[model samples]
Target chain A: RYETVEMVFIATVTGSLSLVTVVGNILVMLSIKVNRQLQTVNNYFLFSLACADLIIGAFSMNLYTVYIIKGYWPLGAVVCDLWLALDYVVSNASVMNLLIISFDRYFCVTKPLTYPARRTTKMAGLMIAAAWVLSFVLWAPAILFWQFVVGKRTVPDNQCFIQFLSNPAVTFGTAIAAFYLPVVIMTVLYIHISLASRSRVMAARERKVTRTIFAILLAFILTWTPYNVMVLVNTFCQSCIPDTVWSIGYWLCYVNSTINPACYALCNATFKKTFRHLLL
Target chain B: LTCVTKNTIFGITTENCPAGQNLCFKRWHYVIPRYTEITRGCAATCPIPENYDSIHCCKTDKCNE
Candidate 1:
């Protein structure tokens, strides 16, 4: 049986994590916004990525911390729906930003001369907008047409949890569209960029940034792949996955929200400097 | 298996289906007033239905087990 001590530990750790993620990402956001030297087209994507990670910290992790401590969902079905929708939106946006950022890096490295001609600040802005909008559209069915709570004959009222319908069409489609596609695109682009660039002076500097982004992507895959795989497996074989394993998977996914900002702060010298100045 | 269970947004909770009913089956659809309704049972023949938003029929010892 699940008990109090474990719940307390989870709450304490995740609560601290939520605080660090929120504060860390907010610093990243402000550093980019307030510093004139940091407002390049690339950093715009980084800013959006920070905002998305902040949403996970401020909303998703905070909510999850409470849910773990409380042991049940006090919020009604509608709020649950909103929470899940926001989760999808923020997570998808985060991954989408990563994909776009890799493309930005790829172009910058492979075609330094044509990169300026091909990529624009306005184009980056538009892609960021498109990512958010598209992510919303993917999860909108749960809020719009589909029912968040299903009534059963044995239960008096609707029950709520953040699970999608067991329909393969919806589950598979959403998972593939929101997560898998972007992951593949980003992975391929990064590998290509790493192999293609070596000689140019700009390449050396950009390569460090590329490695940072690669580390972030690697962290993402390591943390989330288990949870996503569980979701997929549980879709077909629900009983096979234990509750404890599922819970562990979810917590691992949450760990990514914290690791992202840490990645940026550790890898980017400018971010490291700005973070120091802000904190010191 | 024959089961009487309640389905919520999070997941479904139910008693064991009848012993002979090795497959756990669920039927979910939209009804008036409450909006969504779920019926759980065990079936000798597990066929995926076309109309409902989701119809999960498992080939397992307890469908859920």
Candidate 2:
């Protein structure tokens, strides 16, 4: 049973974060769209990233907020699958987009002159498309086939959840493929991007850029790593971790979506100005 | 046996009865402050509780409507 105070606190925090996430990402999209000078390959990538976060904010977070307040999934099995699938796909897509951004920045630093041609809108669009397609491929099977089929079982009216918990191998595998692989790629690319800058001013700017996104990625890992690690540990150790700890991990993961836009606003002057202007 | 599983307010899916389940069950309720809700699925061949106002179980196919 959930304490009333805990439930109220969860509702308030998630509700507020969802509001900020939606508003902040929408402002990013609008700022890029309205300002002619702001339009660029990198901004386009950011635009798509904002869209991904928007889905997490508007759809996933809002749904979870309701679930928190209600204390169960009132929507039924169909939506339970849909909700889990969307959550996995969009969150994974956001990570992949960041991975793509690190690669973009890597090219910008290493090959400045030729970078523009290589990083075309068309190419960026393709990368974004690939991210979404890959996410769908990775997550759809668990939701549509295994979880919904093998683990589907009747529960009391108050109990509603996805069934992938029965397959820890699949869960752990998906987490590693979706999150850890990108972490490795981004780390390597950021190191190269940091080392490749030649001039002092260029290096300073590049460092700031790299640091901004690195911080964003770090925050992502910090918030989500505990959740994933705890889940992995529990999967192997079984009943070692309590439900309260798991719930803490679960809600912490959502904070990443809320934290990202703040990172963008802090690190990028143009984004900061535009976001403030748009809101004020 | 075939059963109709109506989700939420709209949309109905037809499912063949899984092994060991032989009846169709439908439950609908409307709270005073909240709107109506419903769940339909396959049920075991046993007596449903008679104390509920909006609980129904039937033996024939597609009886969950």
Candidate 3:
């Protein structure tokens, strides 16, 4: 299966891209960590988001790349469960992190007078915990125990597939829960932020950070929406979408990780200055 | 019904009074990729075999063997 030049090039580029994802995400964390001025309640959420992106870059991307190129799970069966489990939890963590950020920004811009004053490190930590724990509760245990009810592993030989990958209802429901609903909510929130921010001038620091996060929203919107759309289409018709298109959509998800630092910290001057010093 | 134990994993080559209400089973199973084993005996019932197995169970005389 890895013989084809097409798959080889695809695998090579994606494997390289995942490294860039890791590099970019690590830069974001280091930028915030080194420059104590950049640390704030809003940034603490991004710190966690970058951590989520880092895991996606390091573990999730490389593991899936090997599996896709070989067309089978070369790793042991138990590792597949862990991969799928982390895939859901970390990806969902990013989504909910976006949700909290959007909700935080929405209140900040809408009630510019009172929201920032009310925000605190305690509240920020609480939201981060809620997002992570909520995602873990939804995907991890269910993935581990799902096939137990059938008395045997339902996955095919050497294929790293979810046990419930065939169950139509479960697929539809999980896709909706993980991406569709959050995307809609975040899209609406971004829209209001865009509208409000456009109508008036922002405070000194608010303008740049808003643009950066808005760009991040667009990046994620472009990446995951197409894949999740195909996910829905596959529930009803299996043969409608071809393999190549699915591969492309799957590749886009990791690009979201690769571009997170470009959008988040690269937009600001201090991050650039710190990144420059760290590099030399 | 009487059936061939064809499985001499034990001392004999036949089994009776045991398939009274059950069926005789004959299975050639892959014990982890090609160390295949041919098992023939009596059991309560049997369902389908996996892709790597050739298994059959029947109530008729010597059907499974």
What TM-score, over all chains together, does every model reach?
0.75, 0.72, 0.75
Colliding residue pairs in candidate 1: A161-B10, B1-B18, B1-B21, B1-B42, B2-B18
Q: Which structure is stronger by lDDT: 1 or 2?
A: 2
| Alpha-carbon lDDT, every model | 0.67, 0.68, 0.72
lDDT of 1 by residue, A112-193 (tens): 5865865557877888898888877866565444552554322122333434443434555666666778778877887787
Q: State how far residue A246 of model 2 sits from its true place (Å).
A: 1.1
Give the candidate order by descending TM-score.
3, 1, 2
Number of the top DockQ candidate: 1
Note the B-chain TM-score for every model.
Answer: 0.52, 0.66, 0.59
Model 1 TM-score, all chains together? 0.75
Q: How well is candidate 1 docked (DockQ)?
A: 0.07
Q: DockQ for the candidate 3 complex?
A: 0.02
Which structure among the candidates has the greatest TM-score? 3
CAPRI quality level assigned to candidate 1 from its DockQ score = incorrect
Candidate with more favorable, higher lDDT: 1 or 3: 3
Predicted structure 2, TM vs. truth? 0.72
> For residues A41-152, could you state the per-residue lDDT of candidate 3 as single tens digits?
8789988999999898888878877776655567777787788789878988899899888888888877768557656678888889999999899878887887897788
